[PDB]
Each structure stands twice: as C-alpha cells, then as structure tokens.
Amino acid sequence: SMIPEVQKPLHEQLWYHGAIPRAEVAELLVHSGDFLVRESQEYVLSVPRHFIINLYRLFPSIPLLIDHLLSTQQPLSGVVLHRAVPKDKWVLNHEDLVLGEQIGRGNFGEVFSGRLRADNTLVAVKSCRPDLKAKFLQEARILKQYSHPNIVRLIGVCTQKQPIYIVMELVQGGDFLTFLRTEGARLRVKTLLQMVGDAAAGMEYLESKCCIHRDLAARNCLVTEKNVLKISDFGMSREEADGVYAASGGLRQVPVKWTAPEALNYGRYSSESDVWSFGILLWETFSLGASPYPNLSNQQTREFVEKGGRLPCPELCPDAVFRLMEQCWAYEPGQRPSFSTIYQELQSIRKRH
Amino acid sequence: IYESL
Ligand SMILES: [Cl-]
Ligand SMILES: [Cl-]
C-alpha cells in the first residue's frame, strides 16, 4: 500500500522550496493560483502574494492545510490555489551531501570538497554566506543548461536550507595556475597545447550557448587527474542572445590584466572580450604561470595597453602560439578570432608537434 | 588581481 502524499512530512513535499530566495519564487510562479511553500521558522505560502502560516492555519500539518485549501478551493485576500509548483530536478537536500574541507574561496564565500552520500561521488560545493546574495544562484542557472567535457558540470543545488550551496563536479588536480607553477617544469609543450585546446573547446561551447564568461584566467581553470582542463567559476558569467552584455551601472570588480579595453572602460563584454582573456591565458600557460605585466600596476597596464603595449613572447613559446595570442589582443573586438578559429588553430598546432 | 571600478 501507499502512504498518501498529504501524510508525508513538509520536508518531503515537492512544492516546499525551503530556502528559495525571492527572485526564484518570482521566476517559478507562472499562472494564477500557482503556489509553493517556503521557509521565511515561519513557513510562507506564496500563491505573487506571500501568506505567513499545535495546528496550522491562515490542521495537524502544513500539507494537511494545503490539501484542504486545494480540495475545497476556499480562499486564503481573495486568493485561491490552483497548482502546486514543484522543485526542479536539480534541487538536492542538504543530507544527500557530506561536506568536507575548504578548497577555496570567493565573493560569496567558501568552496568545499564534499561527497554525495548515496554513491560516494566527490564534489565541489560553493557556499553562500543581501543584493549580491540574490546573484549567487546565477552560476547554477547558467550551468544547468550545459554539459561539455571542458566545462565544470553542475550536479545540484541545495536551496532547501541555509546555507545555500551549489554542487559541482570535483576536478581533483586543482586550479591551472597552481598546476603550471608547481608541475609546469616537467610538462611537455604538447601537453600544454592540449590543455589550452581543452580551454578553447570549452569557450567555443560557451559562445555557441550565448554565454560570456567574463573571468577567464588560469586561476579559474581546473585540471583533472589526467590533465584535462575544465573551465570553472561562472559567477560573473552572462547569457546574451544578442551577444553583448552591457555592464548595468554601479561598482564592478574587474580582473584588470585579463580584461579587454572595451569591457574595462565601456563595459562592453562579449565572446570577443573573452577572447582577449584567452590570449592572456595562453600567455600564462606558455610562461608556466608567470604573472602578466609583472612590473606594472593595474592602472599602468590599462595605459600601456591603450598605447599599443602588449605582453612579450614567453621564452620558447612556439611562434604560432604567440601569433595567436597577438591576434587575441587586437584592439578592436571585431578583429579578434572566434573561439572556433582559435580551437582549430590550436589543434592544428598540436597535431604538428 | 581584482579592482573595484
Ligand atoms: Cl543516501
Ligand atoms: Cl586600475
């Protein structure tokens, strides 16, 4: 026999979204009468009007209440229920994750290692410590839509409780900058060519998806135990059908020495500005992780670049890789190659080595 | 690396 749905605890209800932030509820409630329950404990019934809920009212439990309301079609306001809105397939309960030690940090806070309890899969877990707080789930919205060998995979989103997490594949060899600086001296150029080709494949993929990453750098690339490179940190990334993200107004956090002149000074972000950052990533790679413009401040770099200044060819960087960098740093965005062009050229270079 | 601008 079956336990009735309404007899199940609130925790188990498809229409209970726990720590769902404001902007999501907005996004989730489509038609008149659509509803969910969430925690504010004070539970809240969001039909977008928000009704605050040992018996619950506006019964022994909140599913008992919700069913009564639906069944009877009596009002809460005038507002009446039509259809409970379920969680999407990506929502994971906190208890399905075993949190491990911190492996990094960013603006929202720590990244941790973890495991999935059900099958021991190792994972990375981005946590969020409130306007910026509203931007946190951006990386999840973006990554839900993708699946590519050189892009970090989304596994799930823990929005049922605080603190909120975004759960991703763990790429166990760590960031590519540390990798270059720690293993680079034993690395063959052919391996380096493969790894920057991985990065180009990932970026070509992002451009096909109308995604503009905005923080491409060795520090935001990750290396598998087999030296496959995956692009990570999609926190600043934006999706634009028409291909340009226009910075919205207000202070911005800018990785100056990886940022194209037009993105920096006019706030025009595009796959073409991403190509500039790729140019810099190529430089980081074939320098075995040197810091770019090492004797210039950020301000001095902006001036040097505006005057036609560019990074020097790293020693023993193959000539065709440096020509490719140079092209990536063309001043006019229109003059830079596509990621398609870059990936093909890198594969061609690699094949010849 | 990052500048608030
Ligand atoms: Cl389990
Ligand atoms: Cl500056």
Author numbering:
A (entry chain A): 446 to 485, 489 to 495, 501 to 506, 511 to 515, 520 to 537, 541 to 593, 598 to 821
B (entry chain B): 1 to 5
According to the publication:
We have solved the structure of the prototypic SH2-kinase unit of the human Fes tyrosine kinase, which appears specialized for positive signaling. We investigated the structure of a polypeptide from human Fes comprising a linker region N terminal to the SH2 domain, the SH2 domain, and the C-terminal kinase domain. The three structures were determined in complex with the ATP mimetic kinase inhibitor staurosporine and were refined to low R factors and acceptable geometry. The SH2 domain, the kinase domain, and substrate apparently interact cooperatively to yield a functional Fes kinase complex.
To better understand Fes regulation, we also solved structures of unphosphorylated Fes in the absence of phosphomimetic salt ions and Fes in which the regulatory activation segment residue (Y713) had been autophosphorylated in vitro. In both cases, a substrate peptide (IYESL) was cocrystallized. As expected, in phosphorylated Fes, the phosphorylated Y713 formed a network of salt bridges and hydrogen bonds of the sort typically observed in activation segments of activated kinases. This links the conserved catalytic loop arginine (R682) with the activation segment and additionally stabilizes the active conformation through hydrogen bonds to R706 and S716. Second, binding of the substrate peptide also induces a β sheet secondary structure between the substrate peptide and a strand in the activation segment (βI), with typical main chain hydrogen bond interactions. Selectivity for hydrophobic interactions in substrate positions −1 and +3 can be explained by binding of the corresponding substrate residues isoleucine and leucine to hydrophobic pockets on the Fes kinase, and selectivity for acidic residues in position +1 is due to formation of a hydrogen bond with N766 located in helix αG. The binding mode of staurosporine to the ATP pocket is similar to structures reported previously (Bertrand et al., 2003); in addition, two molecules of staurosporine were identified in crystal contacts in Fes-substrate complexes. A striking feature of both structures was the large degree of disorder in SH2 domain loop regions as well as in the loop connecting the sheet β3 with αC. In addition, helix αC showed very high temperature factors, indicating a high degree of mobility of this regulatory element.
